[model samples]
Target: TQPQRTRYSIIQTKTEDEAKAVLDELNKGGDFAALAKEKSADIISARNGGDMGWLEDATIPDELKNAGLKEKGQLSGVIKSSVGFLIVRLDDIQAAHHHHHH
Candidate 1:
């Protein structure tokens, strides 16, 4: 099998202070999309329910790349990135395929 894509969500804000409340609400274990729509500052992703889309590790932002390392359906802690303080969820971290021996 080929390498699988990672799926996740994000909620970014300009400041940690601003992200605090949002993070709290998000951690309450509710619908990520709804929360993102209400609290995320990134309008486009917010409208799309925090969908950053499936991206490879290297292709993802340095701060967000590790999300793929988490278990599926798990949430990442508030991370400081070039974008801002972002809270991310790892929907799926698909394992890579083994094509041949090295």
Candidate 2:
């Protein structure tokens, strides 16, 4: 069973400085979509304003998952990822559910 779920957005950039710039805007309470739509390197997710839809908690890396779960609507510090320097923004959180015979 899935323990829980979280929906998030990301702003990925090829350079560390770009990542830090995005993170700075986020921490300063700037619009996530604004930067994601314009500056994100991951085009597919960028099209949707960096939204990654929903992911199972267990499927996410500890570093990112912890940051998102810390609080909704919060931002994570830049982390190096396979794609590039990565920043994540927490969008939504969902509780786990069960659908089994009683």
Candidate 3:
């Protein structure tokens, strides 16, 4: 079955201003790793240069859910999350697979 979901990576920060700044840089295609190291609150992922890896749709912001469906290298606007406000950068898309027997 195809997924009812989206996949993405992100840079999360404690404050909206910080999230917006990072988003600004990303919108300009700026460096994510550098910004993640400096601003992201999720230090473990930040250690991997803001690499949240592939996320299920629910893990990402509801408003930016479409960003996960967008092309690679796309960025999402800041949205509040459990950890903090987030700026998701779509790294890749997955799911929508199928298995059929004939």
Model 1 lDDT per residue over 1-102, tens place: 444567778878778876777767667867777767776786687687887777764566677654445677676467877767887876656555422431
Taking the tens digit of each residue's C-alpha lDDT, what string does model 3 give over 57-76? 45665556644447766675
In order, candidate lDDTs are: 0.69, 0.74, 0.66
Q: Over all chains combined, what TM-score does candidate 2 have?
A: 0.76
* Model 1 TM-score, all chains together: 0.73
lDDT of 3 at 73: 61
Query: Number of clashing residue pairs in every model?
Result: 0, 0, 0
For residue 66, model 1's alpha carbon misses the true position, in angstroms, by: 4.6
How much lDDT does candidate 2 score? 0.74
For all predicted structures, in order, the TM-scores are 0.73, 0.76, 0.65
- Report how far residue 10 has shifted in candidate 2, in Å: 1.3
lDDT of 2 at 93: 70
Q: Per-residue CA lDDT of candidate 2, range 40-65, in tens?
A: 87657877878878787678877675
